[PDB]
Point group: D2
Chain length 297, copies 4
């Protein structure tokens, strides 16, 4: 049984994916929203399961973590039958005062168990720095692809740009292009990329930046919500999809604003679900317009 | 032709209403979001028409103002045929450094023209202060009811509590109750009330406050979004409707967050519409549960 | 015994005056700085006495209130012998959600007792609004002057501009000029005025505004710190004194930043005193330069 | 001609020192206060010279940098005859998105020229991390001491604690003690230390923390203002001096609040000078009380 990207898309062929696999960064959001410190692991588990129950009916796939919610979402059947389960395969290493300074393949992740539990894909964050070795990132991606493919799971990579370890020469926009030049043809099934310009400013500049990015990615790609205001993300998905993206992966832009509000299950249903549904409707509209365009050729 | 509240409701009998009739308060929002000052009237007109075009398909009624958008929404057919047009009949008088210090019936509002244009209702803000004369507020409401009813328009009143002109003795929560005791049986067809506790805190305290309010209102009522965080408004509508409300009037909680963003028409469609649709679905759910009681 | 302005000045003839007579506005500052609510009267009394003990050695006069600290500063000898005691004679009336909506002469103030206790002056806030009656403000000033003078106390007035009760036509800068045209020759001994432009922007525009103000004040005058950032107040005193002012009255700009910090007496000594001393040195410098003209 | 710490103290024997040697961190403050970007080097030079002219009359020593103001303060005689000139000998290396990720001895610094220009000391920042090699920090301090002492200049070290390169195990308060245990007897003439608890909270806890620090420093020491609110710094100097410190080094706590205000020379005189004078008066008061205490023994 070998899964393809068609097992994690909407019926339109677009991707409408939800990330709830955030770890110490999610603990730090709960503390900054006034939750009593230190914040227990159970606060994250309860949010993650509630988010999966409320939001998986509107997502073509949901991304979860072993550390805080894998066992619970699987045992409580939190994930709607219409939504594919993606499991994070990344181990985040803190350093320099931040939770995710470096990343390796998480060796505690068991692809056999994920496959028997009905999981369809794995995701790997790749931190990209101009002064760190390309060949080590390519080697880690190649090992991860083989881990996925040998179990018939889909391989998803998420290159995220960081400033160099040494020096102050850092253009975020050029880094996103340089990471796509390096990793855009690295043999994964799906590429998750940061939105150019944080989705800000005139639509024309946003489209031109997204088109340059499309030129260096030789697999299906989606935009992350990371660093885009939740109010600009729907337009970023329309622009990215105009330039050749096949949908989105949304995390904070869908669920961050209700962190620390009372009646968590009610807030996920009334505040977060409408945003995730609108992003799904946008993907269906852009894929319909692409079928008319690909038919003109 | 005599309209009733049934002509401004969803098919469920609930109210899912949008307010875009804000005046100098809306100019001040545009300036505080960084629009170049002074902000031209046309910036408000363009927002109001765009909001009517984008959002009226999801509203059982939309509330508009003569000052900035009535002529444009009517002439450009901005309002969906499934959405009733409500026209503001209030003249806001600035004072003490705020745009709405006092309010009178706007004598430039022409109910005959509104009725010929397909309008179904008028709305009147009533500022309520403990140390201002109850009898003057009742007299203004009674004149407004007769202005509506004589043209076959629905009469909507919106009591808003303010601190007293003199003294520092002001409990907002008690003021909302005292305004309902005074105006809750004043012969209007619909009562628009401020949400107790700004929709904050434990759901049980919010329901108990909303039930005390329901006890003093003897007409159909809806909650305003005013002073409720857009993230707490959907729960406030669930709680208010549990306590006897028949729906909502939403303004800033639906459209304020996109003020000053680029691609206005795109932002109203992608950010504001999903919030207004979810509030509509909540009203249909609460009305369905009320029918099964 | 008849006191003159010469009994509330530094040896230079300039005024270096401290206001600690703030009332409910000071309670609201304590609550907004995180003090446990409701804030007890004794929190204000303790701050006011501590500020008088720490800061009166650097002031030519200190302004205190009956409501929170008069009895304590007098009985504990909190005020340095080199500092004149000025007592507030104003009763603040709350309204429209603010602590000082209107002001009258405080009839509980006993000028005989103040004079026996070594007090040298009284101060009266006058709220100025374009659409309120000039003649009532002049009448209140004239009664206050006679109350002071009949006891041999110095008479200090503090006109503060507010927006009109009705309308949105309000230019703060023009209001300060119009209040000086009305009250600048009203027979008080000292005029306390708000700084033009909140002491912001290029020094030349600030001087030109301060010279226009000097043209409409026909008694010695000082600038209030009210609405000027504590970092811009020393320049405002230099500019106002260039334009004809004789010094300053400082409140929040001297003591506000330590509200809610621990070790109150230490913070008043180490943070607030150096600011008050620098303002005193500026007044001595400007008065010296005026004598050499 | 061999200078001692007595050449950089007030007449009381206490230290009342002003730092204006900030580099890219000072450019970033000007940009965040609304100065038109990119901020020219001349904006920093003009601030630094104006600060030296206005504030050196109230300081026992002023710390300046070659990069932005050394030549100008020396040629314009900006530094009052009563104030010793200290020159920074540190080269800041940016990395990980911050201006000062690592530090080495600045080889462009010419101690002979500094000594001929009337300079009395050099200062070296030492970044301290639990998972970086102690022996490399000690080696750099020993080389710097010999560079100073061979020219008859005073040697000043400034250990500043940072989180580890790897891991999330970081107690700032314990790091300040561990840095003093390592470097507190490293043969410099003066130790500049960060204030425990950022000078916050009850005076008794602040004194106990400062006493523990005094136990691990075997040379004269002063507190930095870095991370202490300008409103808490005077109390921090009283507490640190109660626990055995001999004064202060103030930077942002003296001059930061006037960055971007108009009439720079007027603001330095009326806002910044009174704060620096009060800190000087506190040092004189604490040294007088120490002469009575050292006389009881």
């Amino acid at each position: 049984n070998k899964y393809t990207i068609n097992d994690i898309t909407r019926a339109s062929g677009g991707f409408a994916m939800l990330a709830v696999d955030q770890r110490e960064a999610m603990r730090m959001m709960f503390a900054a929203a006034g939750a009593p410190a230190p914040v227990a692991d159970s606060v994250l588990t309860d949010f993650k399961v509630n988010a999966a129950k409320a939001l998986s009916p509107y997502a073509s796939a949901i991304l979860v973590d072993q550390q805080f919610c894998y066992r619970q979402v699987v045992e409580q059947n939190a994930i709607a039958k219409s939504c594919a389960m993606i499991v994070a395969a990344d181990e985040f290493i803190p350093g320099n005062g931040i939770p995710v300074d470096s990343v390796v393949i998480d060796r505690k992740i068991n692809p056999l168990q994920i496959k028997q539990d009905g999981g369809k894909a794995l995701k790997l964050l790749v931190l990209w720095r101009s002064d760190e070795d390309a060949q080590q990132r390519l080697d880690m991606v190649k090992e991860f692809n083989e881990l996925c493919h040998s179990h018939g799971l889909v391989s998803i990579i998420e290159p995220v740009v960081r400033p160099p370890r040494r020096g102050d020469k850092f253009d975020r926009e050029q880094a996103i292009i340089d990471a796509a030049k390096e990793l855009g043809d690295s043999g994964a099934d799906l590429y998750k990329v940061e939105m150019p310009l944080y989705g800000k400013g005139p639509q024309q500049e946003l489209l031109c930046a997204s088109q340059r990015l499309n030129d260096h990615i030789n697999m299906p790609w989606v935009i992350l919500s990371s660093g885009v205001d939740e109010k600009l993300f729907p337009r970023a998905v329309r622009v990215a999809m105009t330039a050749g993206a096949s949908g989105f992966l949304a995390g904070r832009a869908v669920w961050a604003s209700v962190v620390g509000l009372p009646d968590n299950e009610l807030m996920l249903r009334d505040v977060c679900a409408p945003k995730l549904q609108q992003l799904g409707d946008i993907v269906d509209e852009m894929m319909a317009k692409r079928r008319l365009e690909h038919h003109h050729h």
